[PDB]
Amino acid sequence: SVATDSWSIWKLQKAISVLEMENGYWRKKQRAGVMLTVGTRPDGSPDERWCFRVGEMNWATWEQTLPRTLCEEPSG
Amino acid sequence: NSALVVRMYDGLLQAGARLCPNVQLEGIPNLEGLTPLKLAAKEGKIEIFKHILQREFSAPCQSLSRKFTEWCYGPVRVSLYDLASVDSWEENSVLEIIAFHSRSPHRHRMVVLEPLNKLLQAKWDRLIP
Amino acid sequence: ACIQPLLEIDRDSGNPQPLVNAQCTDEYYRGHSALHIAIEKRSLQCVKLLVENGANVHAKACGHFFQKNQDTCFYFGELPLSLAACTKQWDVVNYLLENPHQPASLQAQDSLGNTVLHALVMIADDSAENSALVVRMYDGLLQAGARLCPNVQLEGIPNLEGLTPLKLAAKEGKIEIFKHILQREFSAPCQSLSRKFTEWCYGPVRVSLYDLASVDSWEENSVLEIIAFHSRSPHRHRMVVLEPLNKLLQAKWDRLIPRFCFNFLCYLVYMLIFTAVAYHQAGNSMLLLGHILILLGGVYLLLGQLWYFWRRRLFIWISFMDSYFEILFLLQALLTVLSQVLCFLAIEWYLPLLVSSLVLGWLNLLYYTRGFQHTGIYSVMIQKVILRDLLRFLLVYLVFLFGFAVALVSLSRSILDASLELFKFTIGMLRFRGVVLLLLLAYVLLTYVLLLNMLIALMSETVNSVATDSWSIWKLQKAISVLEMENGYWWCRRKKQRAGVMLTVGTRPDGSPDERWCFRVGEMNWATWEQTLPRTLCEEPSG
Amino acid sequence: TGIYSVMIQKVILRDLLRFLLVYLVFLFGFAVALVSLSRSILDASLELFKFTIGFRGVVLLLLLAYVLLTYVLLLNMLIALMSETVN
Structure with a gap:
């Protein structure tokens, strides 16, 4: 259980x-994600959000x- | 529980999608300035955090979900996880709160979770040099 | 509802390049046809509708998304039939x-030479x-191949690397299809497809025959030779315990014990003479x-090791683990010959180096302790x-000793002398x-911490299923x-x-008798x- | 103490067969290395012991490689004890 x-x-x-390297010295x-248009909101405007893709x-x-x-x- | x-x-x-549609409830900060996900990351709740990151709504209120499937071909598929509060771009990200702010003995478990795992592995592969 | 109208429209318009066989252009997704989409969507009627309208049932889908070992890529046989077979659709395969x-023909190959059988091997x-x-x-x-193309041995088709599906399962390290192929039994009239037959059965005891077509190490590019020298899978050892390979190697080892003991005696006399000199x-004479x-013995052993690294493919899989021991033996022999050459010139560095070439030699005798069935597992x-724990512990101890010796030479006011003192x-x-x-207390405490940490690697290896x-x-x-003893190095025709006794197992789909080199196994x-x-x-029960 | 026995x-069923042989070979190698460094072999072997x-x-x-070999043999006897440690 400890391993x-x-x-x-x-x-x-x-x-x-x-995270400390992403902080940068004294850029x-x-x-890391890709912004994608996932669908439609209750508004007519589409909700586009930064998604990160994981293969399965x-x-x-x-x-x-x-x-x-x-x-x-399957595109891109 | x-x-x-x-x-x-x-x-x-x-019920929030039904009653207040133009309002994102999960964006509401507390007096310390935390969304429910950032607060779950700081307070160390594993099950709700893992559920929110792996959340799918097959309902008409599908916009509430954070897990989507980009495409499915045969056995393979590409799933999408939202990075609203997770990505280390903005201030007080979930990773920044887990590494530097939360005080829990099992906090490391949250790094083993699926959307964080591939993200941190890719960033480690980028920051090797 | 639009598919048959679209195809009727394209047929009535007189298109020279027909709509049904039109394939994608993008290099990511190249060669993909409508038949592939109808197969992936699990619709038999749509496949039948496309095929009745002139679908190329051998269209190869050779894009970057296909035929790849890359990330987020799905490899099958680029062909539609192999796509239907790899996706568990028997009705589509039969149609x-x-x-x-x-x-669709089963002999069909893709851009990698793989048949549908190679594709079934590659997705395991x-x-x-x-x-x-x-x-x-x-x-x-x-x-279905025996029924539809009876005079064709599908398992004999080689790919571009020159592998049958059995050899491909052996190289890629797929155990379960390999284990199944070695002991296939067909209770049907198509008994010739099997590789396991029953010579005689009396009550509970029986003698089974196993085919040795690709298994026997007599022929070139056998399964044993590629498992030992060519496959890089981590589970290769499991594949050796399988039944016909296990009994075959048992018989060959019991036959080749005396040559092993002779080489052991020759090398032991060599090491006694080297230690005495x-x-x-x-x-003086x-x-x-x-x-x-x-000098002559070291030259012979260096020639043997040079031939070994010459004969082994890609330096015996780049000597990551198992072959590094032979590289240790080769380095020991090289230091022996270099020490003898320096003693011939009577240089000042001859007598030290020779001593080093002694110690490793008495370590390399441990090779032969791989024999004798108990010290082999101990070795x-x-x-x-010693593969990873002793190397890392020695490296970190050397770094700590260098730091402590530099501190000692700074506080006292040679570097090597301090290291010697530490030793x-x-x-x-x-x-x-x-x-x-x-x-000094901090150095001893760090050494004790490293000594206690070196037990954790052994504890994890004991946590693993070691038995x-x-x-x-x-x-x-x-x-x-x-295998290396069967080579001989210079008596190569040994x-x-x-192995085995040639027996007539049955009848092929061809009329010719099934004659195959079988190995007998009691059960x-x-x-x-x-x-x-x-x-x-x-x-x-005979013989 | 019966289970200990x-x-x-x-x-001692396992030490004398493999461990004694490897330790004897290592002692002969170390004594021969010492006799090479110097220029009573049994005396040298005893010194080695x-x-x-x-x-x-x-x-x-x-000497560092010899100490590493001693640690490797001790770790192999600990791995044998760990294999014996199964329930």
Whole structure:
């Protein structure tokens, strides 16, 4: 039970180092996500938000129902 | 506890979409200036934080969700996670509050979560040099 | 509802480049056709509608999103049939095979030379549902290939790297489809597709025959040779414990014990002579003869190691783990010959270097302790511990010793001398004075912290499933030894004996008799009484 | 102490076969290295035995590698004890 927690603490240390490096010495940061138009608000205006993409592969999705997609075709 | 809490939280978000549509309730700060996500990150609540980051609404009030699927092809899919308060661009991000502000013994667990994991791995791969 | 009207419109307009076979242009998504989309959306009727209107059922989808080992890429056989097979759609595969308009052929290859069978190999991740789908789809495709193209051995088709699907599963490290292919049984009339047959069954005991088509290390580019030398998967050792490979390597090791013991005796005499010639440095003539013998032995061993690094592909997979031990032996022999060359010139650095070339030699004898079945596992565990823990501990200890020695040379007012003093201390056998005592205490405390931390790597390795894995990795080491001993290095024609006994297993889809080199394996199963009795070659237990 | 005696007999079952052989080979190598550094071999071996429990830089590197080998053998006996530690 301690091994996964120690691995998480190492991930935390690496993240703290990443944040201190993103702070900069004495540059300006860089957003990592891509701004995308997800859909429609209650307003007619579309809600466009900075999304970060994560790949997934599931071999059990054949019996399950397909979720709603933003793009019907894999683009970019 | 957490099942009831997330059920009540999503139910209140749905009722907010029904009653006050032009208002983003999760953007409301407290006197210390925290949205509910930043406060969940600071106070160390794992289950609600993980739920908000992995939140999908299949309802007509789909705009409340933060997890979308960009495209699905065969077994593979690309999911989208919102980075409203998460990205370290703006002041008082979720990562900045977890690393520097929150006092919890299990805070590291929040870094193992799915949307933060790939983001911090990519930023580590960028900041290796 | 628009598809058949659109295709009727394009057919009535007389289009030279038809709409149905139109493929994408973008380099990301190149070659994609409407048939691929109809297959991915799991619609058999849309596939039939597209095929009846002249769909190219062999259209290759060779974009960057396809045919890739890259991130966020889905690799299958670029062909529509391979897409339907990899996505668990048997009805679509059967329609693409048996339609009257344009049947898809199983011999078809993509831009990488892979058939649909290679594609089923490439998408395995050794998961339960995945490997179940892979073996079921693979057996169904083999049966349909026997029915539709009977004179064709589909498993014999090589790709651009020159691999059958079995060799491709061996290289890519896919265990479950590999394990299934080695012991396929068909209770159908298509018994010739199997590789496991039953020579005779009497009650619970039975003798099974395993085919050795690609398995035997007699032929070139075998499965054993690519598992030992070519595949880079972390689970290669598991693949050696599988039943026909296990029994085959057991028989070959039991046959090749005496050559191993002869090489052990020769190297032990070599090390005794090298230690005796080093310990001394009428009698001068004997020492000169011993030095000449050591030079000749080191030259022979260096030639053997040079041939080994010449014969092994990509420096034995860049010597990351298992082959580095042989590089240690090669470096020891190189230091031996360099020390002899410096002693021939009588330089001042001859006698030190030779001594070094002694110690590593007495470490390299540990190679042979991989034998004898208990110290072999002990050596495997010792090599796993010394692979990464001892190197990092020595590096951090060297850095700490350099810092402490630099502090000692700064406070006292050679660098090496301080290091030597630390080494002696390592064996273990008034404000400035208190500060120096505190510095020595801090150095000893850091050394103790490192000593306590080095146990944690061993504790994690004991946390790992070592019981199933240590025996398997020892068997892997024994198999590598069997292959290298079968080579001979200069008596190269020694590896000229096939294993097994050639037997007529059955009839092919072709009329010709099925003749294959089979290996006999005894089995005893007490649960076969509810099951149906299998077809036997011999009715009575013979030989 | 009976279970301790069972563990001790199982350990001496495993120490004398592999550990004694590797330790004897290491002692012969170290004594031969010492006799090379100097210019009674048994005496040197005994000195080596004392060292085990108890040109200059090259001798420091040889002693450091020998101490590392002693630590590796101790860690292998700890790994054997850990394998015996299964429930």
